[PDB]
Amino acid sequence: GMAEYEDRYWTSSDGLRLHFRAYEGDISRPPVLCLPGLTRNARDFEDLATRLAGDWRVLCPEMRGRGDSDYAKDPMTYQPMQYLQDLEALLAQEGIERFVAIGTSLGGLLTMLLAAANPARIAAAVLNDVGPEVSPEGLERIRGYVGQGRNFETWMHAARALQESSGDVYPDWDITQWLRYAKRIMVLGSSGRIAFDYDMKIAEPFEAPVGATPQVDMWPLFDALATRPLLVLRGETSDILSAQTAAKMASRPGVELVTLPRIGHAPTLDEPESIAAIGRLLERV
Length: 285
Ligand SMILES: [Ca+2]
Ligand SMILES: [Ca+2]
Ligand SMILES: [Cl-]
Ligand SMILES: [Cl-]
Known about the structure:
- Pfam families: Abhydrolase_6 (PF12697).
- By secondary structure, this protein is an alpha/beta fold.
- Helix content is 33%, strand content 19%.
- It has an 8-stranded mixed β-sheet, sandwiched between helices. Strands 7-9-8 form a 3-stranded antiparallel β-sheet.
- The longest helix is centred in the first third of the chain and has 15 residues, at 80-94.
- The structure holds calcium ion (CA) (2 copies) and chloride ion (CL) (2 copies).
- Residues 152-154, 157 line the site of one chloride ion.
């Protein structure tokens, strides 16, 4: 079949071949950079990117250890400041000076970190279910599931396993929605088993457990981002971003908050309300 994207690569300082999907579009607008969550890859954006493509150029990178990006020989390089450096390397190598950033979870943190370097580089941004205060309930869950290593013979078994742990996050989903989600985050591997599509060594803590936020008040990073056009999406039931923190974010001038009913951490960005929200944000570029 024909794809809506082309497979592209860039090189990290330390020598990894890292992967991004590139979707062609309007060269007279800045490109849209989609940054996935901790355990996630370019497929989390596979539908959003097709809805934005043509009207926008869209880049969907995968961090080291995720998807088709190379795995690190040194798992201690699986940390947020390294991902930030790798994204700076992508931007340098592709000659991108100004861009829209759409960041989910850890991707939203990376979006704040990129903005901090020079907020004028951000044409506009979307933070998907993440903010400068992260709820401990959600962090506890992350520590618990990353690298736990469950694998399956069939997609149906995988899907049911995901519903068992995330049915509270997406209580209204049907089986087709669970299967679509499963294929975005898992892969049929070499051994014929379906497994999460990332290096299991990402779970190794080294100095701090996986998912740990930088040891800094992150309000300043949010506030610098919020000087640029900003949308914040929140799942109504999110265990990561509280309603209170989101309303504080929204109190900054120009920041629009959209809460997605009956879903938790995080909106898939395939919800009609999310799509429409992103469209409104993109008009402010
Ligand atoms: Ca760590
Ligand atoms: Ca309008
Ligand atoms: Cl199974
Ligand atoms: Cl991490």
